Structure formats: C-alpha cells, structure tokens
Design a protein around this ligand. Sequence first.
Ligand code: NA
Ligand code: NA
Ligand code: NA
Ligand code: NA
Lengths: 249, 249
Amino acid sequence: SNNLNGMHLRLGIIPEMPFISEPSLGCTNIRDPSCYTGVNVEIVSMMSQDLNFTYNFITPEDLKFGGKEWNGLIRDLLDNKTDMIVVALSNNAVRKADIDFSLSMMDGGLGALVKSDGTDLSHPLELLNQDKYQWGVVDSRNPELLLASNQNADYNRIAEDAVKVGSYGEGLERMRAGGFVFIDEIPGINYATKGECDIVQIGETFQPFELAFGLRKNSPFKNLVDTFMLGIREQGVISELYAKYENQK
Amino acid sequence: SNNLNGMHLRLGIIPEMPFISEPSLGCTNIRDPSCYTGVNVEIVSMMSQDLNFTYNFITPEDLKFGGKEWNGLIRDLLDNKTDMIVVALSNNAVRKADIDFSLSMMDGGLGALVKSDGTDLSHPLELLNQDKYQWGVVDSRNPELLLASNQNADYNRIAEDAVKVGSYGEGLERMRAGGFVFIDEIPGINYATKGECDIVQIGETFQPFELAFGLRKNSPFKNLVDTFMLGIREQGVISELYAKYENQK
Ligand code: NA
Ligand code: NA
Ligand code: NA
Ligand code: NA
C-alpha cells in the first residue's frame, strides 16, 4: 500500500533491445514512454502503477551509458537531470563508489563474440598473443570499465589494446564484418545476434555482474524500488518478459 | 565559491509582470528561460551564474499559484515536477506548513483597488455594509488564502462573499470595468495599474507578507539560495530591477 503519492520522476534511457526500443517513428516527443517498448519499459510501467509515480524518459545527449567526472546516463543522474536510470545498468565497483544500484533485474557477464573463421580462438585472453583478429569494446560502457579496472593485468591489456567504438551497434556491425572480436554483455548480445549462425562465442562467459537500475545515494525511494523489483524477479516476471521479447525477434 | 556543481533545476513559473513575462511570441519551447523577461527572470539568471546550476522553467497546467491537497505551483513543487518556485510567492502560514520559503525578495501587502466613482469607500471592511460595489479575489492565490485563514472573522467574511476570479488578469479586467473592488497584492498591483488615473486604493495597505521563492522542506540548496538572495537584497539590486521594469512600462 505504501507508495510515492504521485511523485514525478525523470528516468534515464538509452535505446538498446531487448531492454528499451528506439522511439517509434511517429513519436512526437522523445520523452514520452508511450513511444517505446522493451523489457525495461514494461518493468517501469508496472513499477509506476505499484509505486504511484508519474514519469518521463530522458536520453543523454552523448548516448553513453556512463564512464568516469562522469558522462552519459550517470552524469545526468548525478546532475539531477534524471532521478533513476532504467537501462540494464551494469553494477561495477567504479560506478558503485558514486551511485547506488537497485536490487538487480538479472545477472550478466562478458562474452567475446566473433564471426567464425574455423580458426577461432579458444579463450579470450588468447587475443593477446595473435595478430589475426582485432578486438573492440564500447567507450564509456561497462565492459571497458570492468576490463580496465580489473585486478588482472591481462584484462587491463585487453581494454588497453581494444578498438574503442562509439556505440554497441557499431561494435556489432564491426563484428559482423569479420576479423573482429566484440567483447560485450550477455545475455543482451545473444539477443542481438539471435539467428546469426556465423557468430560464435570464444570460450566461456567471464566477469559476471548484476544488471540493475541506478539511483543517487541516499534515495528516499530506493527501498520501494527494491521491493518491487524483487517481487517481479522472484515471481519469474522478468524472465518471462525477457523470453517474450527474445521470441518476438 | 561553494556552489551546486552543475546541478539541474526545474523552476516553477506563472507569467505575471513585473516579475515574469509571458513567453515571447517567437518562443519554440515554453520551458526555455531565454523566452522570458522580468525581475525574477533576471534574479534567477544571476543566481544560476553564482550557484552554478542549469535550469528550465515549468508552468503549471492549471495556471494557479497554489491553494490547498495543493494545486498550482505548490503542487508541482511537492510532486517533484519542479525544484523551486520562482514567482513572487507569498509567504503565508498555510503554505509554510507544507513548503519552505527562501529569504524574501521584498515585502508585500494587500490592497483594495477600485475604479473611482467619487463615492469611493474609505476602508476595505466597509465592503461588508454596502451594496454598491462587488468585490473579488483570485482563486488559489495568496489574498484569498490570507483572508480565509485570518483570525479576524470580518476578513473571513470578505473572502467568503468575494467574487472568485480565475486569474489576476481577470480580476484587473473586472476592476477596470467599474463597480468592482479587486483585493490583491501590492506592489505588483500598483505596477499593473500604473498610469490608470481612474484607479484608486481604498484605505491603507493591510495584512503584509514576504514575497519569496518556494522550496521543499529540507532542501539541500536552501542555504545557498538564501545567501544569494540576501546579497542582492542588501545591495539594492532587487529594488533596482523592480524600478527598471516599473520605468519600462
Ligand atoms: Na574509451
Ligand atoms: Na597481459
Ligand atoms: Na476560490
Ligand atoms: Na464580519
């Protein structure tokens, strides 16, 4: 019964399926949630009904998730342009120093994906000892941040020598063209490459992380968000949404 | 030197000169401060430069200042749609129960103004014992709220039996047409009627109040706003702005 009594929230988004779509082509206002679909758009709609808040979406000008002074979604949150980030925001230690994360919607991890040549690598760190494949990460997105901050200096070297692409879409494009290992996040990258039989994963998933919403420290509505998220997680609702969008593709 | 480090604020406005103009006719976005002039628009511009915040303006759909569940500017502030109200918001006890007021920009009071008939009244409470003049107040604006909440049951009766108009402009219009005493706020109503020789004030100004900005309780930026406001008040800058706009008319 306890709720936010009609508080208005601005929610930070970046389009990336299956979590958040691009705005409809007919959209007349990019902030209008009715212009969007996706797992997280539906989570937010249900959350708003339960927690009794109104909301609009705000997309950062720089279209970055957030790297560190921060940019992207995290800079908009810290600046009070938004009140909560509702992408699948990866919880890593560098971000957690400066913002809070909700109870998570699901667990992710890194995968190294490539267009299969037959002479595929067997483990991601084999990239450091060869010259057949380039590899890449998105600037100001969690995989780069993880790899560069990791205790393991070989992961540091992977980030150091990676091609830096400007967007997730660009990384996928370069990967699809061949000769290029894109290191990014599961499960999302498995959705993004669904049905592309020439795309394979090198070795095992590595460096797991939670995917959650982002909030300023000491937020008065964190506990209510966490309780709502836990309910739909424990009930299987988040898994069912994800599967619905996976099957729509 | 201490400041808000680039925080973004949404500021609540209602057009009413000399404090805030209507948006320019060429305006492409009603939230854009560059579309406005007025005493308080200039105060906010200087405040933003000193306190290092970015901002836009938000006008309530109902175009009400705030009466009590609240409506108008005060409901937008309580709902977190805005972060500070930057009209000349009158500080009264009913509002102060639920929001905070900044250090004030100036002192106001109520005046009862009328189109002179020669047979003008001598004191505002004489309205209660005659039938020549109607009188009126704006709904959900401070004079009604003051008069209705006052310890003096005769002021209560004035509010009770007053015509309720939907806007300040409408009250002025009815007053200008004759036979109608408009009870509203000085000094603003003296600006609004500058040069109208047929308009006179009945008796003395009464029921003074501070005019200030509105903030949620426990705002972390109240002390910085207060310090800035005090500086421009003590220096005479607010008086000089007011005089500049008074002379532009
Ligand atoms: Na980079
Ligand atoms: Na190494
Ligand atoms: Na009324
Ligand atoms: Na009376």
